Amino acid sequence: NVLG
Amino acid sequence: GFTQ
Amino acid sequence: NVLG
Amino acid sequence: VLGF
Amino acid sequence: NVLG
Amino acid sequence: NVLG
Amino acid sequence: DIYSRLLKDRIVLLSGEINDSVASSIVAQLLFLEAEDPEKDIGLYINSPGGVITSGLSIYDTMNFIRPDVSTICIGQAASMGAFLLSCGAKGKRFSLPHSRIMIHQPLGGAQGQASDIEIISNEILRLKGLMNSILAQNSGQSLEQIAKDTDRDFYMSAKEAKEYGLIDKVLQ
Amino acid sequence: DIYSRLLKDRIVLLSGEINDSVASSIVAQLLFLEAEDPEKDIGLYINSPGGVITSGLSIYDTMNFIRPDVSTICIGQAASMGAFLLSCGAKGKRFSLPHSRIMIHQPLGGAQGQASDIEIISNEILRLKGLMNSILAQNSGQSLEQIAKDTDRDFYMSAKEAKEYGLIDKVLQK
Amino acid sequence: DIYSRLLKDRIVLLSGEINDSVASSIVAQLLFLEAEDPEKDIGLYINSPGGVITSGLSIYDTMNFIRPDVSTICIGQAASMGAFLLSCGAKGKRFSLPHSRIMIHQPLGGAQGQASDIEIISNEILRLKGLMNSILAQNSGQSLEQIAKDTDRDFYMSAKEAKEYGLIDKVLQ
Amino acid sequence: DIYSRLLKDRIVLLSGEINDSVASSIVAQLLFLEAEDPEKDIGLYINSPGGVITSGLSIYDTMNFIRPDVSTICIGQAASMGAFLLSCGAKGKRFSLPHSRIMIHQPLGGAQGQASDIEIISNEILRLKGLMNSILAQNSGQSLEQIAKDTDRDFYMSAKEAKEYGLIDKVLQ
Amino acid sequence: DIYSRLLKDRIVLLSGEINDSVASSIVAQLLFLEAEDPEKDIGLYINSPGGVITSGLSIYDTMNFIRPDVSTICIGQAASMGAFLLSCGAKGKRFSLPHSRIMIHQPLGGAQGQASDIEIISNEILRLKGLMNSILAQNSGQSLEQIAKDTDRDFYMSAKEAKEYGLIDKVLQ
Amino acid sequence: DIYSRLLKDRIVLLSGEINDSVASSIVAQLLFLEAEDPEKDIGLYINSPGGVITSGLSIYDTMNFIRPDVSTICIGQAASMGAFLLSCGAKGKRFSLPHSRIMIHQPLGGAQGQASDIEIISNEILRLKGLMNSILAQNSGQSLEQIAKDTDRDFYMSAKEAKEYGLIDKVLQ
Amino acid sequence: DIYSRLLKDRIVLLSGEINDSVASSIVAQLLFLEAEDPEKDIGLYINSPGGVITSGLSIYDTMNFIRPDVSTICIGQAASMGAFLLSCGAKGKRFSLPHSRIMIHQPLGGAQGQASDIEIISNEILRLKGLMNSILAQNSGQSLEQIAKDTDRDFYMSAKEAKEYGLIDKVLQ
Amino acid sequence: DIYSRLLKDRIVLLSGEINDSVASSIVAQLLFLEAEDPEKDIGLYINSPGGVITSGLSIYDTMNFIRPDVSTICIGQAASMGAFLLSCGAKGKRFSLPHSRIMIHQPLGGAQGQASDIEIISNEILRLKGLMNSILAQNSGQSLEQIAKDTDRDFYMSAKEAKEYGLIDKVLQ
Amino acid sequence: DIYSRLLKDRIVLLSGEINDSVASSIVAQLLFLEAEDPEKDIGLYINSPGGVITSGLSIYDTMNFIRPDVSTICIGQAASMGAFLLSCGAKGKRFSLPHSRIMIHQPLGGAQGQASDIEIISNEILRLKGLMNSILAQNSGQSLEQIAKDTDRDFYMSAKEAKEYGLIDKVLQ
Amino acid sequence: DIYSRLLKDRIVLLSGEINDSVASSIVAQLLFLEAEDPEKDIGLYINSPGGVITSGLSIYDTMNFIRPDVSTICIGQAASMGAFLLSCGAKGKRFSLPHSRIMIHQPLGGAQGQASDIEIISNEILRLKGLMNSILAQNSGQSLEQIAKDTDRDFYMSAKEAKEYGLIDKVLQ
Amino acid sequence: DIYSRLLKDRIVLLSGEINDSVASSIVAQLLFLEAEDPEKDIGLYINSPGGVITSGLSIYDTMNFIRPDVSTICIGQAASMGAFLLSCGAKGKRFSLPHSRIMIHQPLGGAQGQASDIEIISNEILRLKGLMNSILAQNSGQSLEQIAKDTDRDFYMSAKEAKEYGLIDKVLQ
Secondary structure (H helix, E strand, O other), X not given: XXXX | OXXX | OXXX | OXXX | OXXX | OOXX | OOHHHHOOOXXXXXXXXXXXXXXXXXXXXXXXXXXXXXXXXXXXXXXXXXXXXXXXXXXXXXXXXXXXXXXXXXXXXXXXXXXXXXXXXXXXXXXXXXXXXXXXXXXXEEEEEEHHHHHHHHHHHHHHHHHHXXXXXXXXXXXXXXXXXXXXXXXXXXHHHHHHHOOOOEEOO | OHHHHHHOOOEEEEEOOEXXXXXXXXXXXXXXXXXXXXXXXXXXXXXXXXXXXXXXXXXXXXXXXXXXXXEEEEEEEEEOHHHHXXXXXXXXXXXXXXXXXXXXXXXXXXXXXXXXXXXXXXXXXXXXXXXHHHHHHHHHOOOHHHHHHHOOOOEEEEHHHHHXXXXXXXXXXX | OHHHHHHHOOEXXXXXXXXXXXXXXXXXXXXXXXXXXXXXXXXXXXXXOOEEHHHHHHHHHHHHHOOXXXXXXXXXXXXXXXXXXXXXXXOOOEEEOOOOEEEEOOXXXXXXXXXXXXXXXXXXXXXXXXXXXXXXXXXXXXXXXHHHHHXXXXXXXXXXXXXXXXXXXXXXX | OHHHHHHHOOEEEEEEEEOHHHHHHHHHHHHHHHHHOOOXXXXXXXXXXXXXXXXXXXXXXXXXXXXXXXXXXXXXXXXXXXXXXXXXXXXXXXXXXXXOEEEEOOOXXXXXXXXXXXXXXXXXXXXXXXXXXXXXXXXXXXXXXHHHHHOOOOEEEXXXXXXXXXXXXXXXX | OOXXXXXXXXXXXXXXXXXXXXXXXXXXXXXXXXXXXXOOOEEEEEEEOOEOHHHXXXXXXXXXXXXXXXXXXXXXXXXXXXXXHHHOOOOOOOEEOOOOEEEEOOOEEEEEEEHHHHHHHXXXXXXXXXXXXXXXXXXXXXXHHHHHHHOOOOEEEEHHHHHHHOOOOOOOO | OXXXXXXXXXXXXXXXXXXXXXXXXHHHHHHHHHHHOOOOOEEEEEEEOOEOHHHHHHHHHHHHHOOOOEEEEEEEEEEOHXXXXXXXXXXXXXXXXOOOEEEEOOOEEEEEEEHHHHHHHXXXXXXXXXXXXXXXXXXXXXOHHHHHHHHOOOEEEOHHHHHHHOOXXXXXX | OHHHHHHHOOEEEEEOOEOXXXXXXXXXXXXXHHHOOOOOOEEEEEEEOOEXXXXXXXXXXHXXXXXXXXXXXXXXXXXXXXXXXXXXXXXXXXXXOOOOEEEEOOOEEEEEEEHHHHHHHHHHHHHHHHXXXXXXXXXXXXXXXXXXXXXXXXXXXXXXXXXXXXXXXXXXX | OHHHHHHHOOEEEEEOOEOHHHHHHHHHHHHXXXXXXXXXXXXXXXXXXXXXXXXXXXXXXXXXXXXXXXXXXXXXXXXXXXXXXXXXXXXXXXXXXXXXXXXXXXXXXXXXXXXXXXXXXHHHHHHHHHHHHHHHHHHHOOOHHHHHHHOOOOEEEEHXXXXXXXXXXXEOO | OHHHHHHHOOEEEEEOOEOHHHHHHHHXXXXXXXXXXXXXXXXXXXXXXXXXXXXXXXXXXXXXXOXXXXXXXXXXXXXXXXXXXXXXOOOXXXXXXXXXXXXXXXXXXXXXXXXXXXXXXXXXXHHHHHHHHHHHHHHHOXXXXXXXXXXXXXXXXXXXXXXXXXXXXEEOO | OOHHHHHXXXXXXXXXXXXXXXXXXXXXXXXXXXXXXXXXXXXXXXXXXXXXXXXXXXXXXXXXXXXXXXXXXXXXXXXOHHHHHHHOOOOOOEEEOOOOEEXXXXXXXXXXXXXXXXXXXXXXXXXXXXXXXXXXXXXXXXXXHHHHHHOOXXXXXXXXXXXXXXXXXXXXX | OHHHHHHHOOEEEEEOOEOHHHHHHHHHHHHHHHHHOOOOOEEEXXXXXXXXXXHHHHHHHHXXXXXXXXXXXXXXXXXXXXXXXXXXXXXXXXXXXXXOEEEEOOOOOOOOOOHHHHHHHHHHHHHHHHHHHHHHHHHHOOOHHHHHHHOOOOEEEOHHHHHHHOOOOEEOO
């Protein structure tokens, strides 16, 4: 996934 | 299987 | 995590 | 590492 | 042990 | 063991 | 549960990786709403990264099989099979929230074994590739050649671009 | 049920990492409350270290989507997508207990495969970075070059500093 | 449900390590009880070895956030964040059973990556160390210097000694 | 629920390994029963191999914290902390079935890290060793030195021998 | 609920491996059935390959702890601790189905550590060996010597062989 | 090294699965025997279940690359790429021991990823299918379509049958 | 030693995956073969699927570093970095056996972490991709734009096609 | 021994990851080459992705420790600690082949434990960051504050750029 | 053996973790060199992160057991036991390269089992801690009190500070 | 080899844990040394934490089976079987360096299966226990009950204390 | 090398499982012996539990392929392919030691996938089964029917019994  |  |  |  |  |  | 109270307001929530298990649940919900008011609209919220092609097609076909209109709303993201299902929403009733992300691309797959079997499978994935790109073309107005070009590698777009593109009818505010 | 019950008081609890399964629950409760009373305010309690950008935005866009005003309250911590969501609460309705820790940073991700594919991912995460530095700037009142500079690496702040910063409106005290 | 029935008598029970999942359950019951009656005291029984710092903080602040006084009772043990929460109870209402053991210490954590990211984590943990030492000195009557001194390493103490250190008010015989 | 049906007759079953989760569960049953009626005896059946010390102590203290007399009955076995609990039952109400096995020994544990930290942990474990030994001596009428010497290593005994040693009061037939 | 409805009829099934949790489930049922009616018989159907000794003894002692007669009915099999419990049923009420198989043997276990500890464990397992050989003897017209010889290794018997050997009272048909 | 001694007698052994490492060792030996004496015959003993297509092709080509005639002798088995290589030996010098078995088939492989990448791999493996079916017919006298038909699935045959098929020239009695 | 012996005749074998290990060994061999005779030609046989880019470039530069002419001969296959090195052989002396397969493509890699780091990696890999398409265009006489187009995905070709494309000069029949 | 032979020509190869083991090899090879002849240049070929800093500095100091000048040549890549050693060769003799890549960044590491220990490690990794940016500025001609800023993240550059930065003296065209 | 060659010149390299096999090697070379020439100095280069105490002392003693003076040279780093050994060099003949890192600390270890065994292990580690700090004070000229205080947690030093501290005699420039 | 170079001087090193493999090597070296000169003394240096008893006993019985005297020298440590062996050295020639630690204890082991088999193992272990202590009393001068009492739980001691205890004859100061 | 030494006496050892790698080392040895003297007998000692079919088949065929008579000698055991090979020794020189075991059976294997392929694999093993049986028949003097049925399952037999059946000629004493 994409986090931040 | 076969994923889009 | 950070436990203290 | 990056490959070819 | 740290990486430069 | 014992690490010095 | 909470999801069962929204299913009371004609709302369905398609979230996460799509597969046979999940599509069976989405389907069952649509058939269930078919049972209830067969003229009332349905609000299918979509936050998916994609999933099994055939699984997704069971949801697509069901949407167009039931009599009720299926409005689709993109929250979070709609990538791959999710962008696909989002674009299949009832004409004029396909939406997205202002910050969502829409991404389309070609089928992914695998094959192992004898040359003959690899070719068989390769042909089928290619067929599915053609089917999907075809429906995306119809759905957005884009041409076959254009969809094939843009779906070659991952194609990311904002909610606005998704509209300009023809995948989404309106962006709520 | 403890959570179902508190939900009856317009209280929503966002606890832990953000992913599709968690945001889906939050959105579901948010939509539900608006169907109960599209007028009364909503209390979104956040104690989260962050999570999947996408999943966070679904929550964020839904908060503004529905009619009800959504007040956010930070307890414990609000980091990354947690602090981003906290700063998205209705202006004047953003809170934090006194000992919470707020933290903001730039996004994280992965990328594998052909150079072409890595570039696409690289570009898509940079697009998300710029979009969130804008929403943060807008929510806090800070400039875009200030949000950029401070979020290059992990930026930890106490409840008071988070108020000074603009991410929250008031620090509820004992 | 046994636990749910004790909650009816306004008893919560912590027990086990502390993390976000556990903290959120505690907070919910605290907010719940406040709704059911903002004047009646609350008995929070603690048997914990500690846990995530920020998770404990969320419990600490929710305690002081609601109106009812939240008494604390240590059974078995209260170490690390467990002891911190025990001392944070309503003045005059912090208790322990005779044979409980109490232990306080300094923060534990981890960091890896660039020297720059590590300095940042080290700094943040140091900030948490000072914050809790002051609050701990504040709850017991000890001076900041004494707390910093005694928590450098694990500091175990009986319920009696914990009472004499200021951590708790009374020990139920 | 059967186990719940037995709680109704004031019967609590303690079986298996003792840890925080199990300890909390027992404690909740003791507190609940007390609320129901603070004068009616309680039967605490014990079949346990032992477990976490602080967990066991929470049970021990809660048995003396409440009003009800807590009778203990040993079935299967009661070893280590299990046997300690069995001996903490109400005077003259600590029983055991004819073929039960009872075993008492010194605490078990571990430590790792710096010499300084290992030492402090060693001291803490020797503290529990002495604390529990003194309690067994008191509970059985046995001498401290005699208790210490017999628990140096695993000390097994029959229900009948247990009664002689002073751990239980009566062996049922 | 199945198993439950059969409890209203006063039958309890001991099926599969034997351990503390399984035992606790069984004694709970035995205790419950007694509170209900300290008169009517209890049917203990057994299909087990055995298990932990102390776990088994707890079922044993409880069987003869309650007032109602505990008759045992062997179905499928009763091996080791299973055959033990079978034979412990109310003298005159120990049954078995035609094709079931019974098996008796000596205790199994292990020991690790210092020679001093291995000796203690060894002495305890032997203490349990003699204890069960004796009880086993008494439950049948066999001598301690005859039992000690036939259980040195797995001793499989049929139902009729079980009746003649003296473990059950009769074989239904 | 025993193999090294046999090398001085111009004998080379190909045993087991073929892969780049094994293929390169065979190539190196064929280039060495070439440099040692470009006029004398080389003896290639083959016992292999087959392996990596390109690895085999480097051996096949190196075989015709060098000047020395390369006889092939199948001992044990020559399957898949193993049989292929056997049939590539110098005309009239393709041998086999009496009980050895020869098997031929179509290529095996795998493809994973986007539909476009699976297509590319599918075409490449089919090209290698046709390519080797050709060389097989050439070497066997057999026609392409017949070879194609017989290699669809594992085609097992005796040394005599391999001779009659044209894969071998003679069966060393 | 087989390879040590062919090394005497100036034959260097590059087989299998390319990484720093194999790269430093090929590099050494080439340095060695120059101190033995800076005039005579070197035959570099390549049977490779590719590998680490920098590892590969180490070979390329060394080939041009020393004075001896480094001829390249393709046996089996040369893919990616392998095909690159083949095409880097001394002009006029780049060969291939008849059934070898050459395959060119774009670089592969990975990035994990902060947007800024992924970005830095993405730019480095693109810079590497430009670098090699340039050398590859320079070597085959193709337009920088042509190579980038033809290498977007895996481009396979026979020895024949490879020469017609300009990666090699001749196919030793 | 290919590597040993090049050693006789005063050629040392540093390939792959740098760790105590690899460092101990290079140090030993440098000490030797000095005993062998304290006045002849030594050539250190470096193709490394970096490694353990202290391991890296052992090589660095040794290079300066011995009397002979140690020239450095970058062939594949000199990243991090590798780029550090490259810039440490005798002035005027720091080379690189074209197409080699250089990369400098800040130190990396990890720390677990009490805040006190994390603080100690962070400070220590920071001592090493300053120590290295310092020598790096002394070797290249860049100001310390400039090395510190362009090094904050991974800084990639070609042989030519590396030459202008001042990390090497010449690109061997 | 590049190392055997260095042994030829009375140079011994102690690199990496110190355990029994690494200690036996160093000790063996220390005895071999005393046999060859009991009067010539020995150069012991150290790049160790530390290791097992008894293994380290093994080297410590032998050093002072043979007749020849054993100089110690720190390259890269001398941590824990490494530092201790560095400080045991012949007084006046203990060196360090300009950028080395030296670190001293207290013993690390672990214990598991009965309170008695833990206590025993705890005491022994305290024996070693005291023993080593004591030898450390003697070698540096520092007081036992000061050594104890400085080694409570990891104490890092530059070569210059190590000289100033007395652990070493000179820094080679 | 270097240990070999020491074998010529009748020096034998025994490092690490003891097992059949290690013991075997020692025996062979003892057999060899006396089959090289049955008069000159043998030097057995020992740094071991113990190991398999029968493996240790084979070494012991060999040291006495041969003719030359086998002095023992403790370096680093000599624990359990290691200490046993050290004391078995040629009376008057059992040495130890200054900071070597020595440790004695009772044997350790395990057993699984039927009580009969556990009892057989327990008995064999207690046998070797008695044999060990017995031989220890004879080597040190201590009494049999003194040794038995001292080897219960690990008994650590300095070289000096081992000289006093009678395990060794002198400490090479 | 003990094994190579016995090779000078024309003694080959086939011990352990049989596979391609082991078969190859045997074939090679035989091929070498026929070179060194195509007339002197070869001693093939066998102690194998069997192995891969085509692997032993290559050994068997190589045995009759060379000129020298290959005498087979069974030690320990000869089973499956091992027994088969023993019986393939030169008529009159098939030996076995007094206490060796010989066992013969039908072949083992496996298939997985489509029924077409399973069928193909099935009757391929049936073919190898028939072949084996028949060869056993004509090696032992037993009928195909006799062999076929005696190998339906594992048929173990002693040395003297092996002579009676005809698998061997003589049992050395």
